[PDB]
Assembly symmetry: C2
Homo-oligomer: 495 residues x 2
């Protein structure tokens, strides 16, 4: 995958023998932003929420640093409860930096559409109708492309469509940007895509946006690949699959006689604490190598039994995401949150009141400072098998190593898992983005059932270790690639 930039310097990286191009970020590049943003007088940031404030504040600061006259203007829907917050952050009608969504879109040369997936599905025609011909629509996630594709539609021919997709939560996008004013390499990495380029400006505008957000590295992808990776990934190891496997394991361990609190520690605590830390620092091989000789056998039993069951569900989920089925189901699900067709409304409920999450509350409330939990070898084998199976599905489905590793390993162990170690998995299932929450609710049960029906049955039958799986794990090229990619991480902790 190549791209052509007139403004920035393309650097090469090699992962498992596969070369990719990246664009290194840094404040020393800010003087290039006026050139990157030629033809741009106003950037309209549409929506507040999580990414809106972070991106608007970062862009504002970067453009000021660059001595650019470009105006960053927040556009909000009439029902928004975020006007006062926007004004408190210096985005105001008086200064020309806050307005109604439609007015704001109309005046913008680059429209950053940062409203919810559901709001995008409901509003795209009107958004398109308000945009200047030859202007640029920027997305920070590819949901809308997937939605249009599912309906046999595409974007209008008269606008460019680009994406800059940060590998971190909004608050971290802002936090690390401010830190980056002092610490070289502090910022949240992003990937970028150019879906349509109507006038030749799109690539430099995308890279300019990423650099101005403070991305220490910007990786190259396509909008189709980004949405498939993201929507599948959250149903996989990022959220859905981790919830499902921990329910399955907690049930198993307690069935075997383990005390509930210990069962929680050996499942949830271990995955989101010590296992995540170990993978973040030295990778998956170190998880196995850190075990006792006894523990290695247990790890291998779990991995050998769990790899294919996890792959079965991941493979199914990926194809449903790619085919249109899953995005269509998400769009319809959102519509069922309200009364229609004479039927009741069904907003999402909470998970946090079942057996293991009640136990988790107790565990965390008595948990010592900086406790990372026990490393249970069986739990480790299942979790690592899940990670390796997701990597393999994405590999065979044509994704780049940087995207596989950045979104399915690094962002998991460095961004999401630490968040989940602090608040519990239930918190995330109850409080994440709607599309991710729906995904977790739909697919967590699939992982629980397949582990329980197949993986655990294999272990309980005393099945022989599948040495093909184990040797493949130990020799997999991804481990070296993870080491290389892990060096491109931000220079401060991201969550």
């Amino acid at each position: 995958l190549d791209f052509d930039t007139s403004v920035f310097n393309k650097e090469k990286v090699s992962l498992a023998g596969h070369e990719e191009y990246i664009v290194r970020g840094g404040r020393n590049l800010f003087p290039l932003l006026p050139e990157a943003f030629k033809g741009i007088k106003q950037i309209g940031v549409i929506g507040w929420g999580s990414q809106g404030p972070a991106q608007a504040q970062n862009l504002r600061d970067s453009l000021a640093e660059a001595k650019s006259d470009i105006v960053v203007k927040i556009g909000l829907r009439k029902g928004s409860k975020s006007f006062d917050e926007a004004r408190a952050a210096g985005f105001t009608e008086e200064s020309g930096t806050l307005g109604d969504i439609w007015e704001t879109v109309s005046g913008s040369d680059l429209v950053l559409l940062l409203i919810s997936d559901a709001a995008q599905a409901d509003n795209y025609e009107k958004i398109f109708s308000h945009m200047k011909p030859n202007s640029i629509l920027g997305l920070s996630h590819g949901f809308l492309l997937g939605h249009l594709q599912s309906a046999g539609l595409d974007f209008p021919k008269n606008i460019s469509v680009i994406a800059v997709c940060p590998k971190g939560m909004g608050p971290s996008v802002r936090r690390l940007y401010v830190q980056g004013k002092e610490i070289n390499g502090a910022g949240i990495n992003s990937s970028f895509a150019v879906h349509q380029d109507v006038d030749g400006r799109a690539t430099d505008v995308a890279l300019g946006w990423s650099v101005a957000l403070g991305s220490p590295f910007t990786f190259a992808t396509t909008l189709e690949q980004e949405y498939k990776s993201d929507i599948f990934g959250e149903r996989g190891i990022l959220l859905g699959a981790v919830h499902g496997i921990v329910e399955a394991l907690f049930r198993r361990y307690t069935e075997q006689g383990m005390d509930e609190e210990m069962a929680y520690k050996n499942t949830v605590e271990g995955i989101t604490g010590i296992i995540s830390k170990t993978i973040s620092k030295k990778g998956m091989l170190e998880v196995y190598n850190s075990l006792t000789e006894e523990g290695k056998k247990e790890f291998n039993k779990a991995y050998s039994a769990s790899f294919y069951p996890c792959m079965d569900i991941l493979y199914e989920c990926y194809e449903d995401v790619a085919s249109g089925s899953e995005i269509r189901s998400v769009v319809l699900a959102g519509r069922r949150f309200y009364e229609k067709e004479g039927l009741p409304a069904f907003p999402m409920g909470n998970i946090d009141q079942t057996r293991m999450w009640k136990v988790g509350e107790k565990v965390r409330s008595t948990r010592p400072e900086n406790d990372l939990g026990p490393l249970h070898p069986f739990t480790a084998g299942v979790y690592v098998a899940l990670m390796m199976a997701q990597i393999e599905v994405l590999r065979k489905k044509g994704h780049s190593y940087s995207e596989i590793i950045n979104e399915s390993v690094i962002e998991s162990v460095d961004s999401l898992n630490p968040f989940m170690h602090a608040r519990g998995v239930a918190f995330m299932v109850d409080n994440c983005s709607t599309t991710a929450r729906l995904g977790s609710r739909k697919w967590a049960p699939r992982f629980d059932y397949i582990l329980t029906q197949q993986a655990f049955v294999t272990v309980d039958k005393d099945a022989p270790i599948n040495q093909d799986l184990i040797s493949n794990f130990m020799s997999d090229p991804v481990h070296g690639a993870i080491e290389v990619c892990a060096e491109l991480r931000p220079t401060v902790d991201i969550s």
Copy 2:
């Protein structure tokens, strides 16, 4: 829903104040078949699973009784078990009543496509290309319509498309047909649909087909409604939801200290036995009214807590079936049974090796002849909530009372659940046809989790009973409608 038949008389049924037309059959109507089948010289029966053998022999017998010269010809791949069986039943190349699939299609005025969902999805272009213009394609289930719609396609404009959908298993369609030669009104009821009628013959042909199958009554539906009811229904109460709720309840009861065998009895045995039998004989109200005063309170706690959670998943599933999402996922899943794209093969696995199914094997190995099991009021409340929630989704989504009742209540307690009581739920899931098996695996976990995460949490809160839900249940017009429909059973 009206239809216009020149050959058969229709009569009305009134269900919850909604009138529908039905067509009463009987062997006494067989002299009407020649006119019903005007323009038909050969009926080609394509395929030989569970339905082919029954439909071929029933049509052959009915046409013989009618003194008709219409030829019933089986289209099958020479060199197979099915081919052997057809020859043993008297369909032969020598007599021109057995031949190659494509030659049979090409020579048929009515083509009955009885091959699997997967086979229809893989072969429809070739079937269509071999059909005579103005001939008639008959389906016994609407999967192929759902498949075509998912791809934004429809049938060719030069053929009629009809469906006749028996409410029973293939063996019963034949066995009861044979019984019906001696015992009046023995046979399996059907629904019919006319999706396309290119020359005005489609309705009489559909009804002739249904009557000639020995259907004591034929109900009216649409092909789209039939495939939605079927594909959603198997993910719901017919299979997937029963598996899910029983996993959830077994887990709950054992957590509460109930011994495992009793937990199995109070969930699976009760549902497929005494609860099913009670509903079959006297309906859902009788289930509630049979309970002790204490049991009634437990039923109501369970119903109040479970109705909406069940509805939530049923509503989701229904919309995925109707939108194209689910049928596409089924087609894709089939292709993952084999290696492709450098990825492994993933054939369907079994459910029967987990905790509750091992317990069930042990319980069943000792269960006496005709034990219907205990009627646990909490289980009854959950199961009845699920049934009422499915009824409500179907009703709001536009289905007729007869289709709701025949397919989601009657066929379930009278055909499917007795089969599951005999063979076990795990057996039914693990050996079911592919679309239903995939459905069960995908959706059972959803019902398990929604009950566990929501319904049971509500109960454990000591949430006050939702009196409107309970009142709505007791007064629901579906109960009277079931009584009326139940009387049209074979």
